Write a protein that binds this DNA or RNA. Sequence first.
RNA 1: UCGUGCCCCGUGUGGCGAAAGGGAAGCCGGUUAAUAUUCCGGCACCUGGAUGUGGGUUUUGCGCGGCAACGCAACUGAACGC
Lengths: 216, 52, 382, 92, 98
Amino acid sequence: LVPETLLKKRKSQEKARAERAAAVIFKRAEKYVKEYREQEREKIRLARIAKQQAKLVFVIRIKGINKIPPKPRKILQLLRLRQINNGVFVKVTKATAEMIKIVEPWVAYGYPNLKSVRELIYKRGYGKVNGQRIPLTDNAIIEENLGKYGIICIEDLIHEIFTVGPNFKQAANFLWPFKLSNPNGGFRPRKFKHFIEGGDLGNREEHINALIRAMN
Amino acid sequence: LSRAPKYPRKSIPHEPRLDEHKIIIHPLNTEGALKKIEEQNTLVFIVDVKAN
Amino acid sequence: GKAKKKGKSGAARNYMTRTQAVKKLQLSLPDFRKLCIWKGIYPREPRDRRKVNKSATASTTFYYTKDIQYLLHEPLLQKFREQKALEKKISRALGRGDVSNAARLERNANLPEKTGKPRYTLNHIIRERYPTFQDALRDLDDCLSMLFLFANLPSTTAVPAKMIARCERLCHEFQHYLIVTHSLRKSFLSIKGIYYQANIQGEDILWLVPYKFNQRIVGDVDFRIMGTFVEFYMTLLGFVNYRLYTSIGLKYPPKFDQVKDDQGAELAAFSLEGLNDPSQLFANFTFFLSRETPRQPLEFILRAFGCKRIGWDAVLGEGAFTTDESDPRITHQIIDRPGRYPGRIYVQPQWVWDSINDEELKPPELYAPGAQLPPHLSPFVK
Amino acid sequence: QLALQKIEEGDDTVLRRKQLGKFKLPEKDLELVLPDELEDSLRRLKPEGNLLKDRYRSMIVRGKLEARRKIPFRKQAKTKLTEKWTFKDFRI
Amino acid sequence: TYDPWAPDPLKKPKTLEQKPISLAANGKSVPAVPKPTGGYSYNPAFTDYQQRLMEESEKAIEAERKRLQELELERQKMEAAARSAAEAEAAEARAEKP
RNA sequence: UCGUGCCCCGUGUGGCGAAAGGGAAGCCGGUUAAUAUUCCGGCACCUGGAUGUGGGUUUUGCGCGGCAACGCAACUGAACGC
């Protein structure tokens, strides 16, 4: 009986228990006609965007049209915005601006401030190691996952994200998409209501920070 | 719900009906009571008929 | 006299179970547990629990009957009933389609997600539960540990984001009072967090703060009852902060700059102005905190022990004395990373802690970059 | 002999045998950095324990509330589904 | 504003003034934040670290010894039950003026 | 914890009505002008409550003995039933 591996086994079991604890209807003809008109409007808008042809933005997936065209679906695939209330950081280039303009009816995006970036990474920060969601509870995870790029701490990660450094792609890919909460869930008469209502298209600029503060 | 009245029905609470000056009236001065004083270490009083 | 019956006096009259207390108060279980936590009703243990209840088990909770009788007169019961009736009226307005009436009635709910404050006001409860300011100062250890823990948590339905922001605001105000009165005494870097010991009006106050990381909300805790504790402690710390600021003759609450807060000023977003020696250990120095150094404890300790010129990297937030690392006015630089400007002392963060614990400046050679640090002793064990 | 037999801060690590609540509190998790995990800097420190769990345990130990377990699913009201009269009386 | 410290029961009952139950074994009141010792430091002294390591090591040895003892007891109980079941099956097979 | 609920049970309905029916428990001696199983002295009992000490039980966890009738200072026992 080696006490070192006994204590190591006890610790491994305790942290395992800790992470386990921490972890057809009828369709209306009006619905059919509305869905066709939505798809024809989306097709016209996408055709117009395709015919027409570095900052930091925060993008939150919101509820929009139920049927999504394949090109916005693929852009949501690469932007990791499948579920509602998922948030990501995006470096603003020409290609990313075109993607954001394409998926505008399903997103709410803007310019996050330093407080929003810091609070998002500190309070809801998860990294993707081995394809798994690991909370950022120490600087060691960042050191062994992004230490080849000179990023050895959470503050280095925040610096890369906020200043949009050379390794912004690596930092944002390491960061898991943020799962933001619904403030309407705390009140029973508005329990089913979505927090962000669609319709306010375009850049919200610095007003995305109100949404981030409310939902983070 | 318990009562939460907007006004008290009685403005002033009435005093104790039976205080000590009404309970004790006067000691008894008869010869039986006077006997009991030294034979029994007992004092005999006339008290109010409602007092226990 | 007439013969007494069994079970009509004694422990049977003395104790009541949780079920009997809830039925006596006509409350729901969450409201009852909330009220018990807020009023200080504690579980009790009878000598023989069968004398109180014949179906009682080892997990049956008992309370004092007199305590439940005292709970019968608490004004928060009518507040609970008024809020329930108002929620019914809001549901009726939403069901009928009166959106303006629903919003107007929702403005009377005083929802924590909108106000940042508890749904129910506990100001009368604070005076009852702390008869003296000394009693409040003696409970400050638990209060500060809970609030400093919850200032770093994500938003839930139990404690919303505006509530968490208010908890952070109250903690910052308390830290500013400690800085301006130089009441901080000891600080310790343990494996669980940072311990702080201060002295306020002759009382020793010790509280533990987590390291700035992601905090795990595990299922082994009752998070909603923790939220009720948070509401009570934030109500207490508001009044404690007001009393201390008025005692040292400062207006309360301090002026708060939302623009600097959104830029990340944290402690620097507060402006303190008047109403209507170990404390000068760092008074002659200019400090520069690097990116990898813990800015909030470093700034708190340096400002409480005398430093007036603290700068840092731009990503650490607004409010630095200087952002240029190459500034010649910088005397000391705190580093924790494995190209040195001459005439500058480069030290690891343990130098500050050891120096303020020993009330004297430590030799900088033992705290150099890449050096094996001296052991960090506990300043509370004699 | 009977008289001499009668003649002959609290520590949260050693608790009393009787429970307060639904269960006796478990032993605390090991809060110790092992020699293979020892580091030489504050930056590489891996913090131990859980402070929220520590506050919850502290309140249970000091007796402000009793230890309860989470109930993930509650028993539902036993009901029976039936078709409404108007939908039953629908004819086409 | 409000600055505190400056028929309904205006007095609290003394049952409320009764102190709460302590779960500590000695019966005394545990502090809300206990004072940390030197062995909990992030960069502790060698003596305190070795003291904590020795205490946790001997506790782990005792726990593993007890666990192996109970595993052996369970194994012996299962073997005795299996032997009794085999004996029962064999007995059933052989039966079938003052 | 979808925290603002869920489960179990069925038996009905209250009061008055006996100083001879039913019913917890006090005897002896003495004492006054006049009361006394009520006063005094001695010696007891019933009902209810709280919480100790001794004794008992338990490492084969909730006693042992007798063939039995049953005994012995103790010697767990809710709902629902007989």
